[PDB]
Every structure is written in structure tokens, then in C-alpha cells.
Design a protein around this ligand. Sequence first.
Ligand SMILES: [Mg+2]
Ligand SMILES: [Mg+2]
Ligand SMILES: [Mg+2]
Ligand SMILES: [Mg+2]
Ligand SMILES: [Mg+2]
Ligand SMILES: [Mg+2]
Lengths: 299, 299, 299, 299, 299, 299
Amino acid sequence: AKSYSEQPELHAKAPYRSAMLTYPGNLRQALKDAMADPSKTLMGVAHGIPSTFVTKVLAATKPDFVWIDVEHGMFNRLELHDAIHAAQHHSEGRSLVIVRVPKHDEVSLSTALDAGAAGIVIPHVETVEEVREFVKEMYYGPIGRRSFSPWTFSPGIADASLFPNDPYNVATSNNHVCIIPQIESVKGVENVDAIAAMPEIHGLMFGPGDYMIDAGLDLNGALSGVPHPTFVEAMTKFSTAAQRNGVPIFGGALSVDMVPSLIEQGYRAIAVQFDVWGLSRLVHGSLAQARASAKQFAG
Amino acid sequence: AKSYSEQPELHAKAPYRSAMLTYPGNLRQALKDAMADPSKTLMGVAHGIPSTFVTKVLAATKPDFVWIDVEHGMFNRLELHDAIHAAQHHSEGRSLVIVRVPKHDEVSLSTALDAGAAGIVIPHVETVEEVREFVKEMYYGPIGRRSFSPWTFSPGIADASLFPNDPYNVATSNNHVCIIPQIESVKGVENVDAIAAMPEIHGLMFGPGDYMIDAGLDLNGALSGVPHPTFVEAMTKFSTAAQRNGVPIFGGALSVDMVPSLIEQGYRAIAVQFDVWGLSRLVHGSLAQARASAKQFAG
Amino acid sequence: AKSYSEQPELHAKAPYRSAMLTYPGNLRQALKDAMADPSKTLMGVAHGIPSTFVTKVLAATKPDFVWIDVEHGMFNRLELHDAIHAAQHHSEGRSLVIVRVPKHDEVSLSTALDAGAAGIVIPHVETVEEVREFVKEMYYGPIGRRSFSPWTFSPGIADASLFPNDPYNVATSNNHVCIIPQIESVKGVENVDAIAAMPEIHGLMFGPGDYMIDAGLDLNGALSGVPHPTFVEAMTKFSTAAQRNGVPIFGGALSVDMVPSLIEQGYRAIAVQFDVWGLSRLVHGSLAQARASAKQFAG
Amino acid sequence: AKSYSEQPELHAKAPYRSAMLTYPGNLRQALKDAMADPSKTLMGVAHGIPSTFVTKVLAATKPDFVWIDVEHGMFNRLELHDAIHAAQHHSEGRSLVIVRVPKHDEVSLSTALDAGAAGIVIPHVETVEEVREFVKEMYYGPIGRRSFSPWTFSPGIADASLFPNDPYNVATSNNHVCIIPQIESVKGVENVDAIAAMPEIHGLMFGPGDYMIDAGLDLNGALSGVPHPTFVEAMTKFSTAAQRNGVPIFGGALSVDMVPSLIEQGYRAIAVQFDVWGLSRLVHGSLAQARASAKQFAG
Amino acid sequence: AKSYSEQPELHAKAPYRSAMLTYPGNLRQALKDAMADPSKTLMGVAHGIPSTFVTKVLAATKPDFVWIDVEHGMFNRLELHDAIHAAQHHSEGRSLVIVRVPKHDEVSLSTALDAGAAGIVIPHVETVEEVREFVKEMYYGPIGRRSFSPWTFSPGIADASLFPNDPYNVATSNNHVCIIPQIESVKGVENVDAIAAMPEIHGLMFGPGDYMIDAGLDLNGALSGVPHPTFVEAMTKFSTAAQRNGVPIFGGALSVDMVPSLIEQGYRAIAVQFDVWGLSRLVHGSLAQARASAKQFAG
Amino acid sequence: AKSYSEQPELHAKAPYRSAMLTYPGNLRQALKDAMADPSKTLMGVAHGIPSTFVTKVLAATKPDFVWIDVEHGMFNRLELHDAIHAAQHHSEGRSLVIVRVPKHDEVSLSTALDAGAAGIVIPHVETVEEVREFVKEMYYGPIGRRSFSPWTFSPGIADASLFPNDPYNVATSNNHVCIIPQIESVKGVENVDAIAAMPEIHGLMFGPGDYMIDAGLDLNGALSGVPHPTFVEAMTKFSTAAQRNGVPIFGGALSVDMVPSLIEQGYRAIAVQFDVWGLSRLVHGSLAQARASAKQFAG
Ligand SMILES: [Mg+2]
Ligand SMILES: [Mg+2]
Ligand SMILES: [Mg+2]
Ligand SMILES: [Mg+2]
Ligand SMILES: [Mg+2]
Ligand SMILES: [Mg+2]
């Protein structure tokens, strides 16, 4: 009368999980659902601390996704695999996993996919050809030429799929996994109309920092506020291209109160906290407040 | 004209660091200084995530101390050693290290000391004898019988000390290192007057959670607020014992605005943030706010 | 019409899982249910390979339990914690975790419990006092004095329990966790009547190997088969003591066809495969058969 | 009269080991010997579990080779190095090491070679040019341009070689190491005659799974058994090409009783067990049998 | 009167350290200073043992630089990051870090730079184009297109720089970091005049071993001493090219007494000890001497 | 005509290795042989760097033993196990392993033994009772009550022994393993006659550093050389006790030229190099010499 199965209120709500949590959840559908109803915009967390223990703490807060950065995050291969597994298992399927991979590292990519990542963000995209190279490695034939791993499952033992006669989860992979090009250079912005129009993509992300450096704009240099006009134009071209092609934007929110504006701009997947900067600011701020409040005891 | 040495404003302020950051900073003096001037109460951070990368992020915020929990933190031996080194090196000596060790684990204790911990918190202390067993293992003769490690330094190469003719840093260790008993049981509270009076101790900490469980008090059970009277009496006996013997209290601040009251109560070392709970609450709260702000787009 | 939630046949059957998989499943009830209906005798796997990847492979086969050996298994602290989490999460709660700990290692014990182990096997038990020392460390007051860890959960975020007003999962821990003394010495057998009668225990295990060595019996020395009479008497005294006190026996099955006999003897938790020996024999046997079948091509 | 040296029956039979076990054994000769006498066909084990402890267990069963999969196995760099060392040292040279590397990862390749791998399997080979890129990186001049590592040996201390005046083991490497292209795509099969004819190769392997996906064939879709004709033709073209050029085939045996047929088909290196699937099936099968045998106790 | 700050003699002399030790020290200036005054030639140590503990021991000896070999050293990604941090922090900024990376591995390169490496050595350089590919990845725009990592610092908390209005340390990176092509092939030597003349480079290194193999010269084959004339000519062409273009040479000293000659030849960064070979020879030599001295006790 | 088996000069000389290198070599006999012929005094290396890669480098120099310090060396459990395996396997049985364990850590002890350590050094021994507690845990019945591990071998597959009908290697363990008390306190010296007379011990070691601290003697305080008389007396009492009871002394040689004198004093196992201090001094010395030789180029 009190077992877990008899207490529905305790059950996990994981609308997009696969039959097995070692496989990617359906980010493809999650994005389509957020486009249809923006109140369902995915709210997630950026994960750059190379610690599966941290992934577990993040997963327990039940974010819509955990965005793991392998381009700049110091994750070893096995640890990346374990972090992806931990995100999906410790959130019991509620947290989809998106991984930003190094632009030319095939091993990081296959590791992320084999472990269950539902989305791949490609940095520094400037051509449609660069994106198609990822399509080839990310999807099984007939879509691409992704290599099938034998170690991810066990025939007749651990091979469940949401799809019919899909013992190898090829359908799961080709139907759930998403590709998200990241535009973060002058050349990328100049060719964004073509990239945004690719039938193969499921999202678009901008890299303000790298863009500003490449554009020769003083990053964090708004004298009297107001971003540089060149940046404004770049973001306008980028966002309009995504919107016209029905592509949701992926991005981060410097402050959570920016969310409504981002949604109005077309963002449907927003990282609302970043583990490294978030923890740093939380601790630094608490220390500052504490010391300040102790000054009254001087003398 | 612009090297680091020529830019004093960039130099680290590490009032208590030892000659080498592989050795403990002077927590003994830091505590005495905070007692003399409570505006100098040490503000630190509790560290339970077993990741040296996290220690580095915490150390960069320059807390007065990093409190590493080995009683319940999943740190392996080498990783504990590396975390202690990282706390002191990445804060360039500004962050002293305090380690709460498992009550009967000699290896955790020697590892913490050999790596440079300046303070040891002993859990579940109930007798003066239990504390004296730690004195024996924590200090070199004539104070105790701590074993001298040969691998922590290199004779004539890396053996600097703040003390005269102290090539083995025996003086550094015996003069800088502190012992902090933690009172967290009914029997501990009943014998706190004796424990607080020990000439060997340098601080006292209370464990509210374990105490409440041991006392049969409903942890987190304040119907209309107001803590249980049995707990109030326990804290009064504990704090009065510490105060009368000139022993500073070590503790945590549930909310940073509690700091002034804690200082008034005799706390001179306060953990103002906890990595696990802090990160969890930060992310969970941001997610909640984000989703709430997206509801306006429903339909 | 095809999401996971809409495909009940794919849902995990985890009769004893807790509200959160970071907490122990109800082994206490599982054992009582197996005693009531022996067809429900728990069939599990012994895990001595210190690799969480292996734990994941074992968990995917959905054993009733994964028995992790820390007395002789080379698991580091963090890796033990991760293996316990992996067993429960990758089996989605179907696999309870039992850990045999080193007889005097408090850190191994607290690590196993804090990570979610539902059963603790104590090696070389010879006195009721030795068992009561484990009761003190394994259960929270009023039963024992186990220390409460703050890092295992997150207040108001990740603290679900199957029990009412149990935000700290103290009820979960004290109601789900089991103690299993292991009898494996001459003195242990001589005092088994007293050990078996302890109200605090939930199972009993025998250690044939250590017993035989201690008894001076030629381990693996059955000339014409037929175990030594001294061993037979020892097992009879052991099994009769367990049976008369209503204590289920925990043990291993050298060959799976021994299961019926073991159940008839009172075993209600049986390890039917061992990862190290199982993998070794599987590979060695396949190699032998392969080479033998190739001999026909000689010349 | 009883030391190891005085007990020849206990000595290791390692026909192809190098002077030092940190260097590759002579797989080149082992393959030639198996071609001359098929009863000597190499029987090995596939290793996909990223654990050196597992490598040690596998090595102790004395397989003719351990096939480590780095294309899909989650081995970190140092762990790959350690696994290769463990395979050769724990089998005392009896187990040669073959590594399937990611197709474009130079670091995985140099790590595998520097650690002592005697064979490299190249996945998804479709052109002779792709194979020649591996020849360049796998062999020292004059054969290729492989970079010489200084850290693998110690001049005048640990630099033994089976070859004369070969202090750097350049001869060992160029004479012992083998290249094995893996054909697993429609284009690969279409160009197999050319690949099989390369004077540089020492073996050929087929990838049925990837081939079937690429060919649009229902993997595991034999309605009434009988593989797809397109697959049969592909295997016939592949095997005939290998046979006509005197190239031994490398492959796996779904069941050990397939060995004779595989040898008749030209296989001279067969993986007769796979650690991940083998352990999974062993445990799952034992659990099933155990539970089934317990049903008689229901009620 | 005796704190660290009051004991200047104990302070670290780190002429080239950055504002934060997580950022590269100024190797660019160190090299220019050594060119101006060769008595300041950088004396460092080569590090091939994949252990951060070893890095710490090496850093404590205060070398002018620690040269980490990732081309052939078995460093995992996170461990490489930690070794670079340890070299700079445990030497308190006195030891600059130079990393030789695999020629085509972008992740090794970004990891080395993000962790604080001040110099990158590129192996097997044969064309100016190969070097310019590294310039693109090593420096931020306008010099290159290096991607900016968000996880290396914390805005407003840990972002100090020696340069004005340089919150992102872009100036630090572009002004401190050096590129050192390594010439170690016949084609490399044939094109050394062009490589040496590149305005983008800051040093040149020769690879005698790889060169000799590529040139078909008997490495370690000086019958009556005297290196092969082809090698002499190669080194002459190499050194003259470096000297005429004002490029300092980077190299190793087989024996420390070679230093004066190397400086006369234009070397300004010399690795005077190698951890693997150094430790090996030290131990092997001590063992030999010890056993030899014990022979007098025979009988 | 050139295989390894056909080149006896390349074969390993391992007089004391067991049938399997996962088991302890015969240190018991090695010590007896050194006592009979002191020219055979064991020359080994002390290993305090927690890196199995380092163990491999040390093992390749073929020391008579590798002395691993777990009392003060930061070895994790699995890493200790791997280091012990590496020492014996990479020296192909020539290097026996001695481990100094923490005085009260049962897990360190069982790990060291289960991995193959042939000798255990017990620190801070002061009573015969302390030594007998180790005898109980180190040897199987009838000698002690050491627990038998099932994971160290594989029945019928990997269970070879030098002894007859010893499938569990109980004879190997009880006949090869040695106990070495370490005397390093005033009380230890005062009771050395009794400790030295124990029939159970196989060696004796002194701890000069800890002794001097405990005795209140200025460690490294020989004004005009000449050790303190109290120390001289202590060493005389210690050495005479060992000699009269036929117990060989275990110790270290500050400089290799001390070996003859140590042998004359009764030492039969001498650590002639220490990895941490050895590497530190080698590098520091090379740096000093290099910089000194560069001074001539100043100006
Ligand atoms: Mg970017
Ligand atoms: Mg507590
Ligand atoms: Mg036992
Ligand atoms: Mg394939
Ligand atoms: Mg080279
Ligand atoms: Mg000592």
C-alpha cells in the first residue's frame, strides 16, 4: 500500500526518454513541442566541470537538459561517457543530454553518441559542407555512415527500443538525435542564410564571445551599455535566418530574467545556469556579503 | 615596467601562508587574530564534491578557508591530497584548509596532514580521551607521536620554513595545525564542559543534525518555527562552554545574513556556502524561475 | 501514442525501489517476501571486478541484487560509491545492492551505506558484540548512532522518500537496510546459535573457504567426493540455527543447478554467477573448445 | 630443487614474444604459421570493457590474442596503454595484442603502437590510399614515417631486442607489427579486390553489422533464416579476394562451434568470446535458469 | 615579525609569471631576454611520466620550464590540464610550461593552451603551411581564430591580467604564447630556410632520432665516434637558419657538460634532465654500484 | 633460430619468482640466501610516487625489490594493487615487493598481500603483541587467520603454485611472505630485545627520523658531524639484537658508498635509491650545474 509503484506522485515525468536510459531521449520531439508551445521552451544547465559527481548533482535538480561542453570542458573519454549516462539515469530520463564537441574530433563525437547524447552542437560552423560531415558521422545509413557499436547494448538482454523491430536502436538514434550548428565567426554570420536553410539541422546557436573576438569588437566594452551595432546586425541576421526556416535557437541566459525576451526572439533551448561560473559567483558573493557584515565588529 | 613583480596590486594577500604551499598555513594564528578582532572572523566554503577541479574553482574565489569533508565526502586518498594542495596553491596561500576526518581512520588523518591541512575536525567527540588520541597522531614529539613523512619535501631543495633551523618543518606543523572537536550527540553535550576545557584544542564545532537525531528531536520539525527547547539548551551549554574557555566556535551559516548573530555567539570560522547544496539550489532555483517565466507563452 | 509512458510493457518492474535511486531499495521486505514464497528467492550476481562499467553491464541483466565485495574487491572509495549508484540506476531500481565490507573499516561501511547499499555482509563474525558494533554504525538513532551525511541529498530539491514526513530519509534507511553476519571460522560455528538468535539480523552467510582453512580441512580435497564430516556438521549447525530463528541464508551457487537444493536448505538470496570466475571460465572454455576443434586441420 | 626455474612444466609457452614484453610480439610470424598449419589458427578474445583489471583476467586465460576495440571501447589514453601492457605481461607474452583504432585518430594509433600492440585493425576501409596513410604512421622509415618515442625504453638499461644491433627496437616494430583493413561498407566491398591485393597488408576483416546497415539490409532480419543474398555475395567477394592474395581473414565466432567452418573459409585469427556480450549473456542466462528452477516452490 | 610577507628571502622569484597562475607566463619575453644575455638561457626538464605527482616534484626543483610531451607521453586530457597547472602553481610561477603536441590533435592543443602552456612545440614540421595551421588555432583574432574558453576564468572574480583592460586575458595569451616548429625529417631539413624565416615563430627544435631514422642513418652507430656527415650537414643547415633569422634553438643536453657548447651553437632553451631516462639511469646505476660493492663479501 | 625461446641470453633471471607473478616471490628464501652469502644482499629501490607508470620504470631497472610505502605514499587501493602487480610483472619476477603499511589499516594490508607483496614492514612497533596482530592477518591458518580472497585467481585456469597440491596457493603465501617490524621510537628501542627474539619475524628495520624526533634529538643537527650518542647507543642496541637472533636488517643507504659498511653491520636488504628524493636531487643538481656553466656568457 506504500511501495514506489503504489505512489504515483513519486514517479518520474520523463516525456521524451527512450526505452533504455543508455540511449538518447527524444530531443527532436522536445524541440518540436517547444516550437508548438513556447511555454515548453527547454530550460537546462551548462556543464563544464569534469566530474560525474557534479553531473549527478545537476541531474537531481531535473533540468530539461544538461549541456556538456567537450570542446572546452576537460572531460576524458570514459568520464564523458559516464557523465552522459549519469545525466540521463540520475534524472530518470527527464534530462536530455546535448554535447558541444570539438569541431574535428571523431572520437569525442562517437563517444557522445554511443553514450546517449540526444543533441550535438558543432562549433565554428561556416559552411554547409562542415555540417554535412557531421551528418555523415552522426546518423546511420541511409542518412549517414555512422559506425554501429556492439558494446552499447546486449542482444536479447538489453536492447529495448520505443520503435518496432528495432533491436539495434537504429531508429531510436536516427529519429531522436539532433544537430545544432554554432555560428561564431564573421564568415559564419556571412553565410548564415545557407546554414539555417539546411534540411538536416534541428537548431542554431550563436557564440557571442568568439564572434566578437573575430569581428574585432571590444568584448565587454559597452561604454554606456548598448552592444556594438555590428554585433546587433549579426544577431539580427542570425535570428531572422533561424526564424524564417523554422529552426529553434539554442542559447544561454546571462540572467534568468532574460528568458522571456529570449523566447520572444525564438530561443527554445536555454541554458539558465552554468556550473563553473554559477558556483564561482555563488561562493564569491557569499564570502563578500559575509565579510562585509562582519566589519561592524572591528576594533 | 609591467611585469607581475612591478604590479603590487596584483599580488596575493596571504597573511598566514607557510614558506611553501605544500605545508599548512597558520590557522592557529588566524583564529587568535579573529578572536582579537571579530571583523576578521574566517569566512569559508564547505567542500563535499570529490573533484579537484571544483577545489580549484572554490580556491579561485579566495575564501579564508576550504573545509573538506572526508567523513562523508567521497574523496579517494590521492584525490584528497590533491584537493588540499589545490586549495592552497590556487588561492596562492590565502585559503587555509580544514578537514573533517572519519573518527577512526588514521590514513585519512595522515593524508590530510601530510598534504598541508591546517585544521582537523573530529566528529562525534564524547570524551577527552578521544581527543587526546588525535593529539598523539597530529603532532610530532614532544607533543605527540605523529610519524614524519619523507615524501612531502626534498632536503636542501624544497624544505623552506618560516621557522629558524626547521629543515623538516616540524615547527611549522606543531605551531600551525589546529584540532577542532565536533560535538554532535547527547553524551557529547553532557560532557562538553570537560571537552571545552582541554588545553589542546583550538576550536569547537556543533553537529545539529546528528545531535537532533541522537536526541530524538524531529529534525526540521519546527511546527510554528522555534527550535526544540532541548536543542536550545544544548546549544547554550555548548556555546557557553566554548566562550568561558576562550575557544572559538566553528560552524556553518544556513543563510549568509546569519553571520552577525553567529559572530555575536562566538563563531570565528564560518562556512558561508556549501558546494553540493549551493550548486543544487542555484540550478534548481534558476530552472524554476525560468519555467515560471515561460508560462505566459502557453497556448 | 508511442512515447515511453504510453508503452507499459517497457516499464521497469522494481517492486522494492525507494523514491530515489540514490537510496537503498527495500531488501528487508524482499527477504521477508522470499521467506513467505521461496519461488521469490533473490537471484543475484557477485561483483569483484573494480569497474563501474562492469557494474553497468551486470545491472543491465536485471539481477535481483548485485553483491559487491569490498573486503577483497579492489574498489576505491569513490569507485565503490559509483558502482553502488550504477547498480541501482542502470537496473532502474530492480537490482538491490549488498556489500560485503572489510570487518573493521568504518569508511568502507559509511561509503556503502551513503551510496545506497541495502545490505551489509560482515565477514568473520564470531560474537554478538561484533555484530552490535555494526548495528551502531549502520542505523540512525534510536537504533544506532550512524552519522547523517549532508551530501547524499538536497533539501527541498532531491529528498523524496516512500515514508511520510521523512525529508532526511532516516525512515528509509532504518526500515530498508539489512545486516548479514558471515560465519567462516571454527569459533564462529561454535557460537552460531547465539549469533543466529540476534533480533538485529536479517540474514546469515557461510564462508566455506575460510572455514575449511581455519578448520584445517583440505579445501578442494574430496578424494572420492563427499565433503569432510567436520564441514558437514558445521553446515548443519549453521543452517539449523538460521532456520530455527527464521533467518534466511545468503550464499552462492557453484553451479546453477544447485539452486533448488539451496532453496530447500533455507537459502533466500543466492549469487548465481560471479563476475571474475564467470568471465574467466567462459573465455578459457571457449578458447579450449576452439583450439580443440582446429586440431583436425593439422598437417 | 623446487624453484620456478627448476619446474619447466610451469614455464610460459610464448612462441612469439619479443625480448621485452613492452614491445609487440611477432604477430606477423604467428599469422604466417597459422596459414601454413590452420590447426594453429589464433583463438582470441574481444575486449571492449575499459578496465585493465578485466584485461588481466582475460590475459590469465592465455588467449592467443586480446583484441582491444578503441574505435568503440571507452578506453582513455593511459588506460589503453596500461591494458596493452597488462595483456602481454599477465599472459607472460602468450597473448598478442590487436587494436582496432578510430579511423582518423593519430593519438590512439601511436598510443597502441608505443604500448606494444602487434596488430592494428583499420575500420571502414574503402581505398588503398586510406591504408597507405596507416602504413606511413605505423612503420619507421624506410617503410613509413612513424615517430620514434623516447619514453618506451631506457638506453643501455631496458632496450633488449630479438634482432641484432637493434637498440631502438626499430627492427622489432617493423618486422612484428601487422595492418588489417576492415571492410564494412558497400564501397569497401566494391573495391575489395584492390585492397586485398595490397602488398602492405597482413590480414582482412569484415564488419557484417556496419555493412548490412550501409547496404540497407535488415540486420537480424532472416525471416526463415538464410542471410540476404546481397550479403552472401559480399562475403563471397571478400573471402575470395583474401584467399587469392594469400591474406588471412580476421573475424569473430558468434558461437564456438562455427570455428571449423570459419577456418575452412580462410579465417586464421578468430575472436571466440567477447567480454561485454559474453559476461552479459552468462549472467542473464544464469539468472533465468535460477528463477525458472525456483518456480516449483511457489505457493 | 616572522610571517611569510615579512620574510622576503622566502619569496618566489618568478620574473615572467602572469597575474594568475592558471594563465601562461611570458615565455616570449623569457626567450628574448635569453637571446640578449645567454647566461639566462632557460634550463628545464623534460616530463614524459604521466603523473601530476611527478610534475609537482619536478616543479619544486624550480626549473626555468617543464617540457611536457603529449606527442608520446601518455597524458589523458584532464591529467594534462592538471600537470600544466601543477607545474606553474607548485613552482609559484617560476617554471614556464612548454608542450609538444601530437601534430594533428586539436584537443591536445586547446587543452594545453587553456591550461596555461606558454609554448607549443610542433613535431615533424616540413612546410610553412603546417605552422600556419597552428598559428590559426593558437592565437585569438586578429592573429588567429583560437576559440575562447569560458571555463578557464570567472568574470569579475578570477580574471586578473598583467595587461590593461584585458578581462578575458586575450592580450596575455597573444603576447605570452610561443610557437616552436620541430625539424626532424629529411624534407624538414630541406625546407628549413623557409621555416626558420617565418615571422610567426619564436623558436626552433631539431629531432635527431626521427631525423636519423628518416635519413637512413644508423642511429647510435658511430663506429669510432664522429656523427655521420649527413647529420652534421643537417644540423649545420638547421642551426645556421635559426641563427640568421634571430630564432633561438630549443633542445636537450645528453649530458649537462654539453650546455656551454649548446649555448655557443644558439640554444636558448635546454632540457637538462628527462624524467623517464633520468630516473631509470639513476636507479639502475645505484643498483649496479651497490651490487658491485657487495661482491667483496662473497663466500 | 632467433625466437625468444631460442635466445637464452635474453631470458629473465628470477630465482625467487612464484609460478604466477600475481603471487609473492620467495622473499623468505632470498633473505636466507643473503644471510648465507652477504654478496647477495638485496639491493632495491624505495617507491613513494603514486604512479604505476613509475613502478614500471623502476621495475625495468631490475632491482632486487621495490619497497612501496603505503604509510606515507599516496597510493589509492586499486593503484597500490596495480603497482604491486607492475613491479613483479615488468621485472618478470626479478623484483620482489615489500610494502610498508599504515600500522592499523587492515585494508592496506590485505590489498598488499592479495596483490602479491612478499614482505610487510610494520611501522612504529613497540610490543610483541602488535607484531602478533599482523601475524594473524598476514598468514592463513594454522599460522594465522588471514582471509582467503576468491578474486586473486581462477580455479583450474590460473592457479599454478610451486608447491604440491596447492591449488589455492596457501603454501605459497605462508612460505614466501615475510614480516619486518620497524623500530622507530624510544619505547621501541627499549623493548627491541624482545621484538628481535620473536620467532615469527624475518627482518628488522630502524626509522632514524621518527626515532630522533621521539628522542628529542636534533634531526640533522650534527654540529661537527658525529651523530648524537643517544642515537648511536640506540642503533647499537638495535643492530646487536638483530644480529644475536639471526635477523637480517632492512634499511636505506643515504649514499651508495655506504653499502659495504651497512652489510658489515648486518643489513641484508638495502634501498639504494628513493624515487622522490632521487628524482628531485637529480633534476635540481642538473639545473644548478647548467645555470652555473652558463654564467660565462653574461654580458
Ligand atoms: Mg565559441
Ligand atoms: Mg555529523
Ligand atoms: Mg571469507
Ligand atoms: Mg564496424
Ligand atoms: Mg621526434
Ligand atoms: Mg617512520
